[PDB]
Design a protein around this nucleic acid. Structure first.
Lengths: 50, 132, 88, 155, 122
RNA sequence: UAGCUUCAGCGAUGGAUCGGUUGCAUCGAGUAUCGAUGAAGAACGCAGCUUGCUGCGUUACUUACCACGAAUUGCAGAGAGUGGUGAAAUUUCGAACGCAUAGCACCAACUGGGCCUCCAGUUGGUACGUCUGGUUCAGGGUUGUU
RNA sequence: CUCAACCUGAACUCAGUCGUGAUUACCCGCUGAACUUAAGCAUAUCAUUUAGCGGAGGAAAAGAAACUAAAAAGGAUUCCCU
RNA sequence: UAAAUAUCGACUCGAUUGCGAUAGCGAACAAGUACCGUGAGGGAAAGUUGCAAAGGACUUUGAAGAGAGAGUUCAAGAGAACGUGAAAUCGCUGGAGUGGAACCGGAGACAGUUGAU
RNA sequence: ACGUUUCCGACCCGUCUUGAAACACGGAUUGCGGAGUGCUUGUCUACUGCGAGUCAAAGGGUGUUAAAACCUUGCGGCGAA
RNA sequence: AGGCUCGGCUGGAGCUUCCGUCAGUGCAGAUCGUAAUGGUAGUAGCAAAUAUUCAAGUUCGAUCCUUGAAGACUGAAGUGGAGAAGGGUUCCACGUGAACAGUAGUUGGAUGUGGGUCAGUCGAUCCUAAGGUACUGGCGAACGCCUUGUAUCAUCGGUGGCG
């Protein structure tokens, strides 16, 4: 909603930061196994049950 | 056979300690033997390898090649020796990692602390060899 | 009609975010968290909820102070002293 | 459904016994721990006997056992008086005092009085201050043969 | 570059404050460089500047706390932050002298009753 | 012829099986250490590039001190860095403490607004129950005195 | 009616203290089922047990006989075998 | 009012006739995670290139995926979803059969396989 | 010999059932997993040791290839009325 | 007979005879658990809400993107213009190959990279409604409950002088 609370805005900001592709140089680290960000979220598919 | 009740002969525990050792422990793990002449000259049998040491490869496909230790990749448990390189496809050169236990030190990079360390090791070797 | 038609009217949240546990289980009208019991002084745990206890028990977080105390216990909780003044 | 000639079952397993199970896998560990505790105590209180206080002789109570004797809790005050030992002194020189037991028979009293007498004969008393001995304290070369006693005192 | 707390220890309060301000100004400059397409060499100095600020604050706080501890070393009541931080139970424990205290009856029993050292011949 | 079925050879689809194993299960041993000096837990934040996990708390993938003694590493980059850890520091919620519980308010000092009754900033403080003592009190409850 | 005692009861952002809330394996006090067995079922059983509440420690609790017993007597508590 | 006693929940250790990735804790891995429910709560799947990335330069067709050459490598038919790579199912080449089932036992024949101091 | 072709025979398995090829039920196909166990207490049987005895408990002593092994019981279990 | 030996091919690090003893010791079924795969089958089907056409642009590539011309529709209780709850970046620009948009796609609420929300006057903030929840007070073995009321109750604050 447009009229929201500061705490809700803070949580939404953190979720926005976390929704991001993995840096490419991470795949070149020693012993790395991650190939992508497996915790990405689409606003329409999965909803933050706040 | 081990006698110490606080030393574990568990393969899993040994492997876990080896592969999760911190840097200062990996230093000790990555030790190399001295050549015969260096051993007689300095009194010690082996020392934790260090950059700017001179080594000779004792085993592998690069047996007999000499050079200087360019880097000690403690994370990968290998050392990069000078002149021991291969060529990638594009043409760049990459150093081939060698395990220090497969090389022998021909010249020790000595400084204040390395000299003190060698003195301690030689004193201990003499002390024990006298009793034996 | 119970079902597709009725689900279109679900737009008022019964629960919101709890201050103590951060879960979306704070009942607005009851003013109580269905998970941790906030704002009761005590915590909500039940022995029939073994998995829930395991989920929210000690050690599932950071235990920063407990680990600090464990570290300081090893040396008898010494205070007011410093290592022997030395150098390189 | 028991069939044929059988002894009627009696197993008391109708409770939730799986919640109360006790195993004995730590029996040798307990043995070792108790041996180590005895060794530590012996080191702590050397040269005093490891067992501790001296116990009295006692007849087993009922007629099924009255022909056997055994170690009692301590020595009655009548026995201590008969042996000429103060209760305060006994507590110091390591003799158990049973403040509840009383003697009603001369033979029972005399057995324990003799036991106290032989314990006093076998006792070695160290000087309270090593520099200066006193009266009652054992002699110098007696204090050299002193050794820690293991097992019951006067078995 | 990397400061040495050994050297900073001798400085004075005003000097430490001035050096802290210089380090903060340098950090602000580097933060501007971060946004304005700064070079990697420039950006690599941010960590050093931050840890230098940390060192200066460490020295300042250590000297202040030492002075305060000395000041309150003899007061019967000390500020809460200057008291021993053991566990709460340890703080509630009795003091050593209170534990050593003995009543007259116990002292008399200690005087009269005293265990001796003895051995028993086998 | 084609199709269908079948045999031999070749190739797909699928991920069984085999080979270990920093994991798990069980047994045993040694210790006693959470919290108003703010715990357990939660939230948010912190890295040159680093979402997650791990670590940490505005000194924020860590400061100081002490040991060892040359690295870190994906790219950069410049007594290292690891370990111990006694000094310092330790955000906000949370028993959670000014009142409420996602908001607003009181007391002082100091500073700036030119002065200030008015603003703004900073710092200290204002919870409930309870013990000991202190101060100021109330009641013909009992008593003395004028 | 004045002053002064005591008794009782208050207010204090008075000086200095202490409690609250976590943890579950064991420990202490309460509260307290039904499934089940009885080839049905109600006493009984499950069980003085799941579940619920409170309170501690490194152990807790117990503990120095208003005891056992009926011998020619034993002698705090706790635990093991029987 | 200590000891002997209980207990691995916490911290630190040693073992095993236990399991060996559908097993063993739910979790060998960014697991009490992703995800689900308004909530109490429910709750996975997921180990493996190679000694070493040496992780396929360069040429060539294509917009590209991709392919044809080449190179690295003990080896790539170990090529990234990468150790091995089963059955079911499926495509191609050759042979043979083929009237409303197909399979199957016994007995020969043919094709075929194999042995002959 | 799981190829073809002939002659003879030839109904789909598991199950409950007096009776199944059944117009009775389960079964589309393949892999992997998948079900008489543990313990207490009885009884009989087989084998081993000793034998009017036998086994010894908790425990103790010793044992460092020390949770093992070895030694150890006026007393206890069963047996001897 | 249960099964076994050897040959050939693949594979790359363990396996095995015999003697005792032990067992999480043998699958065709359990509308068995789990994973994968068939015939059906290129089949059912992708048919509500009137409707698209011509020329050009871009592109390797256009029924579907963009421009212009035409023809229609919603028809102001709209298929228009803005808000509350809810969503949480879906907003805007520039790239886009794969996946997704049950045809397609050069386009996209998709995907990669960036940008974007400015208040003394608009709201919250402030007052109280229905009602909730504290105090004490009672109850309760207890966590804690019950009452919001003369139950409880020593609950203060206003002018003025003095200072």
């Amino acid at each position: 909603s447009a009229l929201k609370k500061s705490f809700i805005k803070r949580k939404l900001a953190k979720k926005q930061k976390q929704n991001r592709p993995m840096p490419q140089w991470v795949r070149m680290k020693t012993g790395n196994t991650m190939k992508y960000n497996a915790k990405r979220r689409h606003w329409r598919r999965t909803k933050l049950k706040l | 056979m081990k006698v110490n009740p606080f030393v574990s002969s568990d393969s899993g525990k040994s492997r876990k300690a080896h592969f999760n050792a911190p840097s200062h422990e990996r230093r000790r793990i990555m030790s190399a033997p001295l050549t015969k002449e260096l051993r007689t000259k300095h009194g010690i049998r082996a020392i934790p390898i260090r950059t700017d040491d001179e080594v000779v490869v004792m085993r592998g496909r690069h047996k007999g090649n000499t050079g200087r230790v360019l880097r000690c990749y403690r994370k990968k448990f290998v050392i990069h020796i000078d002149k021991i390189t291969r060529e990638k496809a594009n043409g760049s050169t990459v150093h081939i990692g060698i395990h220090p236990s497969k090389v022998a030190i021909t010249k020790l990079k000595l400084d204040k602390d390395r000299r003190a360390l060698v003195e301690r090791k030689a004193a201990g070797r003499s002390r024990v060899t006298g009793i034996l | 009609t119970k079902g597709t038609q009725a689900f279109g009217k679900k737009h008022v949240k019964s629960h919101t975010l709890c201050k103590r546990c951060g879960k979306s289980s704070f009942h607005i009208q009851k003013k109580r968290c269905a998970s941790c019991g906030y704002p009761d002084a005590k915590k909500r745990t039940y022995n029939w909820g073994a998995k829930s206890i395991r989920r929210r028990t000690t050690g599932t977080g950071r235990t920063r102070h407990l680990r600090d105390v464990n570290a300081r216990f090893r040396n008898g909780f010494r205070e007011g002293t410093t290592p022997k003044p030395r150098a390189q | 459904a028991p069939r044929g000639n059988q002894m009627l079952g009696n197993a008391h397993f109708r409770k939730h016994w799986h919640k109360r199970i006790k195993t004995w896998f730590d029996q040798p560990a307990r043995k070792l721990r108790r041996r180590q505790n005895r060794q530590a105590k012996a080191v702590e209180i050397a040269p005093r006997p490891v067992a501790g206080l001296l116990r009295s002789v006692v007849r087993c109570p009922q007629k099924r056992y009255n022909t056997k004797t055994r170690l009692g809790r301590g020595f009655s005050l009548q026995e201590l008086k008969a042996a000429g030992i103060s209760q305060a002194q006994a507590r110091t020189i390591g003799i158990a005092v049973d403040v509840r037991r009383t003697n009603k028979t001369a033979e029972g009293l005399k057995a324990n009085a003799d036991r106290l007498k032989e314990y006093k004969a076998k006792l070695i008393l160290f000087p309270k201050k090593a520099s200066a001995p006193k009266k009652g304290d054992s002699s110098a070369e007696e204090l050299k043969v002193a050794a820690q006693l293991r097992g019951d005192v006067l078995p | 570059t990397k400061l040495k707390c050994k050297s900073l220890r001798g400085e004075k309060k005003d000097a430490l404050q001035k050096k802290l301000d210089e380090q903060k100004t340098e950090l602000a400059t580097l933060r501007v460089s971060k946004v304005t397409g700064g070079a990697a060499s420039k950006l690599s100095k941010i960590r050093v500047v931050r840890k230098n600020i940390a060192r200066l604050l460490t020295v300042i706080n250590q000297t202040q706390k030492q002075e305060l501890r000395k000041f309150y070393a003899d007061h019967k009541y000390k500020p809460i932050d200057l008291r021993l931080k053991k566990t709460r139970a340890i703080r509630r424990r009795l003091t050593a002298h209170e534990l050593s205290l003995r009543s007259a009856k116990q002292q008399a029993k200690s005087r009269n009753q005293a265990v001796r050292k003895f051995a028993v011949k086998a």
